[model samples]
Structures are given as C-alpha cells and as structure tokens.
Target: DCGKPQVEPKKCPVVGGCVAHPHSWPWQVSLRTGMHFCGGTLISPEWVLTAAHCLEKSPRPSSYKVILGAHQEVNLEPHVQEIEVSRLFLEPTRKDIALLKLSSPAVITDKVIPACLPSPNYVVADRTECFITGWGETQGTFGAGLLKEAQLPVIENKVCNRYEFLNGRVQSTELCAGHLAGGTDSCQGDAGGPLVCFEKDKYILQGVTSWGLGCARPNKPGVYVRVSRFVTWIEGVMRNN
Candidate 1:
C-alpha cells in the first residue's frame, strides 16, 4: 500500500496517471536508513541532479543511491550501482536546485547515457514540445511501481505571464507547460524529474520537474527548474569538485 495519503482534488486530480520511461535514469535517496525517495536525470553518468528540497533536510550524501538504466522496481535491484556522493551543490537564492556527484564515474553505454545540459543562453520558444519522465506517482497518490513519462509543449512566457497564478511572480528562470483543459502533467513523487527537448537527435535536459498546481489540469502548466539558469553553476561545480 502507498504510505502517502490520497491527494486532495483541490491540490491535484487524476491520481495515479503518469508513468516513467524504461530508458530514463532512476535515483533512490534516503533521510534515514530505510526511508527513500526518487529523482530523475541531468547528465547520464557524471552527475545526478535533483531538487535541493529533497536534500535540504537529508543532507547526508552517503544516504543516496543513484540507479542507472532501469525502468521497473525489480530491475532496480540487479542494475543498481551504489555510488557515494562526492559533492552536493545547491543554489543560494532558489533552494529548488541541487547536484549530486557520484564517488566514481558512471560508464556510458548505449543503454546508459547522460543527457546534455541546455545552454544558459538558450530560450524556449512558444509552444515548443518537450518530454518529461519520472519514477514518481502515476496518480495523485504514491505507489511502489514503475516509472512514467509524457510529452508537453512549452508555453510562451508571455502567455504564462498573463495567468494570475503565474504572472510576474513566476521567475524568468522558470518555464511552464501543460494544457489548460486538464490531463497530462507531473504528479506527486515526480519531483526532480527530467523535462527534455530534442535537439539534433539528442535529448537535452531543459528543466527539472519542480512543482505543479495539480496533476494534469487545464490552464495550470507544470513548473520546472530552468536548466539554462544553472548551466554555469553546474559546470563550475563539476569542474572544481
């Protein structure tokens, strides 16, 4: 049984809907010996990025496990590679950002590869389509299950800026997506998942699943941690550490 309580409709609807793809990277981090949560990708092998919120209280990097090349819960056991976090980087102003460095580098193979970080200068144009994947909840409630994914178009900042919920309050460092009519969105347990755009055949990580008003609701676009804003900081941290 899922330990988390059922999500309130005012909070999020369509419980247990989203699913993670088989190709994406999986992560298991814990605050205690047995307690753990999931996060998605950044770079395939060199780095595993996630929300600072996940690490805020659980600061011990040793409690984390970055699982690569998995989709199912059972596959997680055999393919899992336990790596000690060499470093942890978090944004000063925005606590939504965090990066975990593995003790050893992950081997790059056809099945296991890192996604490229988007350019800081890059800007997402209106209605640009992107894909998101995570090992979070399928419904509004949490469950022990496989990962899931969905494709969504980028909402123009101008349009996004018009919403009272978003407006000027939404940071330029953030981007929004999803339909205003409902259906198709990231749900609980989807935090720190990947929002990727296809560029020249390669999938570039454009956003980190941050938060959303509700699961797959119309007019409410899912908020993401803009990857472009963290490029330099991510690079600098990776190089020096």
Candidate 2:
C-alpha cells in the first residue's frame, strides 16, 4: 500500500552503478547510534523519517536504534528489525525534518514497509526520476555493507541555485537531487535517506537526505528535506504523536 515493494528494486539504471535489492528497499532505515550513523524512513507502524542533523549530536531517546530489515549491517540478515526509539519528533520549523517515536509496532514483514508520504502540495516534476536508498558511501569509504542505490535527477530550486559552491543556496526548504555532471551522491552515512520519486505508481517520498558540498562533486547535488515542504509539518507530527 505505502510505496509498495515486495521485492522489485533491482533495476540499477546506471548513474553511480547500484546494489540495492536485498529486501528491495522496503522503507529503508538503519540509523543506529553506536554504529550506523544515519538514514531512516519507515513512516508508520510507529514512524521514523529522519535527519534533523540526525538528532543533532545525540539528543537521546535512549540514544537511538532502528535496523528494520537491514540488507547488511551484519546480524546475518533474515529480516532484521531492532527498533527502540521512543519519541523524538523535532520540526519546530527548523525543517531538516525529524521524527522517531517507535518503541514497538513494526512487524510488517516482506522485509518491512511504509514509505509513501507526499501528497499535500506534492510538486515533483523537473527532471524527476528519483531514488536515493542508503547505507551511505559508495566511495570515500566507511558506510556501505550492501545497500546502495542511486539514480538522482530532480534538481529544482532554480537550477539548484546555479552551483558554483551553491551560490544562492538552494532553498524553499531545500530539494536538489544529483548528477549535475557529478558522479552521484547521498554520502557519509546518508543522513536520513529516502528521496524516492516514481509518481503515479507509488514510490513517492521526495527527499530527506539533507546536506551536501562534498561526495560526488562536480556541481554538487544531493541536498534534500523538501518532502513536499514538510507535508503539513509531516501530517502534524504524525497526528499529534
């Protein structure tokens, strides 16, 4: 129902190569606090969606945890899960967007699922065709054990603020994707992953991986968090917590 994905994500389509396909991106999420840096997006069965500077240096809620069908971060795999992050919601207009809740409720199966948000003022269309997926790094080392996908394109914000180290700074909450002649993006532990895209058939989540200026350079692409300008503040913080 939400972004569907009972195993299909292996296309690759080139861009920065590819890999995804183990559990096929069923709502991605990996964020740990002692190990996997960031990346999240489950959206329900208790909620997730990440990056607000990834809890801005700890912030606590028991320090965080959330693996959910991880394709690789060890645990041998067999539909991972992990959980444990009882409430953290941020979003006081800072807009790097955050939310965690979940201290239970997430047994979806078929490798966990829940990622469809984007519908209030949803405007995607530019170069469109997205797909970010995480586990982060595909290059400068650190953060990749197997889940890595790419594609990218979107790029709005008036030509991404005309690059040159992002002169005007891509605002309106933020949205640019990748390949402005760059190699590919969403790096470092892919802070709060997701980007998605595929319009009428499902896949819609429109960005969240936040920040960039390094990793896959050339006119630097990657910035996100423009999830339909915070979809009414993420549906009013998942309907008042």
Candidate 3:
C-alpha cells in the first residue's frame, strides 16, 4: 500500500547551507521566469543535470541559464561563470532526469568541479544516510533566497514498501530518504538537484531530486531517481550528443 502517515513540519530543521562534502559540488544552474519557477544543479562544466518534470510544463531551452560556482544569490558575474543553455534531453518514463548542454564549456576552477556519477553496482539501502542541497524554499513555507540543505537518513526499501503511502507506485529505480519523524526535505525550486553520498575522494550522484508528498512528512520518504539505474542511458546520451 502506498499510504503512510502524514509528516509534521515541526520535526525537521532547516539546513544552514547547501549540503556537500568538502570540495564536492560547487556549481548551480537556475531556471526562472524573472523569479517564478526555478530548478538547477552542480554538474559538469558543459552540462547541468536537472529534473525532466521541470521541463514538462516549462519553457524552451533558451529560457534557462547555467550558473557555475555560486553560493549565495544568482549573481553570475562575480561568483559564477554564466552560460546559456544550448539543448535539452529528457527520457520517456523517468520524467525525472534532464541534461542541459551549455553553449560553451565552463572553465573549471577550484571553486567549480564536476560531480562524480554513481557506480553501476551501487545500491543505497534504507536508513542509509545522505544529504540534499538546493536553492529551494527553507522549511516547507514559501520563502526563497539563499541555498539551503538538510541531512537525512535513507529509509529502507522494505520499511518504505510496507508503508501504505508507498503502495505499488514506488519502483526499485527510486529510493526514499528523509527523517521518518518529519522535516528535512526538498521543496519548490529544488527539483533536479543532487542527492549526494561521499566515498573516498569523490562525492557521487546517488539520486536526482524527483518528488515527494510534502516537505518532510512521516511515512513519506523523499523520492529520487536512482542514478545507477540510468547509467547506461546517461552514457548513451552523453556519447551521442
């Protein structure tokens, strides 16, 4: 059953900044209609990985821009290297991943580097800890400005599956991560961001911020696109483009 208890907002805390291991992700690309809907990521110098859902009802590729090496607001000149988007790629069913090609490759610096992709054999178990960071609204309320992040543990698939909330819709290609007690979740403007995990010297992209019932609710774990499952498709897309 895909039914679970509702999560309370009081249980979770706001993340101070974007969640990241030291020297991991440092790039951000934001899409906006002057200041309305927005999404982005910390991907390669020539690409920005985001959610296909962002494009489902969004504008054209020329409507978006990629910003690298930014921390605060979307000031591209001083803190980040700004580039226009050249093309977009979206898969059929996933509707969860998208790649934005930049007009020109960004000059990677100490402050900006590519995030590593997850290994094909990688598997993120339930209750496994991970972190999510984005420029989404802090808490569940509607107010957006600074980039915020939250640390949450992964919910085991069995436990998540047992819940009435998950039901038959949750697939193996998707994983849930968040506090069962509520709090610590992605919100509006956070879609297409990274759910990262650290191993050795690199931080791998475990999942792409997909969707959730509401920000930080009990029984409802944050759902994300399992990066490992899309490895072949991603590689094929990269090679052909």
- Find the candidate with the highest lDDT and give its number: 2
**Tens-digit per-residue lDDT, 1-241, candidate 1:** 1111122111122133444434443222211113336565637366787777767666677766666655554445565454567667777676487888877877654335667787886887778888776656565445345655667788877787785545554577888877666667776666776777767655678888887777776677888888898888888887887
When sorted by TM-score, best at the front, the candidate numbers are: 3, 1, 2
Q: Candidate 1 — worst ten consecutive residues by lDDT sum? A: 1-10
Per-candidate TM-scores read 0.82, 0.34, 0.83
Q: What are the RMSD figures for all models against the true structure?
A: 7.7, 15.2, 7.6
List lDDT for all candidates, in order: 0.64, 0.80, 0.65
How far in Å is the alpha carbon of 134 misplaced in model 1? 0.6
* lDDT (10s digit) by residue, model 2, range 38-104: 8888977788888888889877888998888778875547658888998898888677879898899
Predicted structure 1, TM vs. truth: 0.82
TM-score of 2: 0.34
Task: Please tell me which predicted candidate would have the highest TM-score against the true structure.
Answer: 3
Of 1 and 3, the candidate ranking higher by lDDT: 3
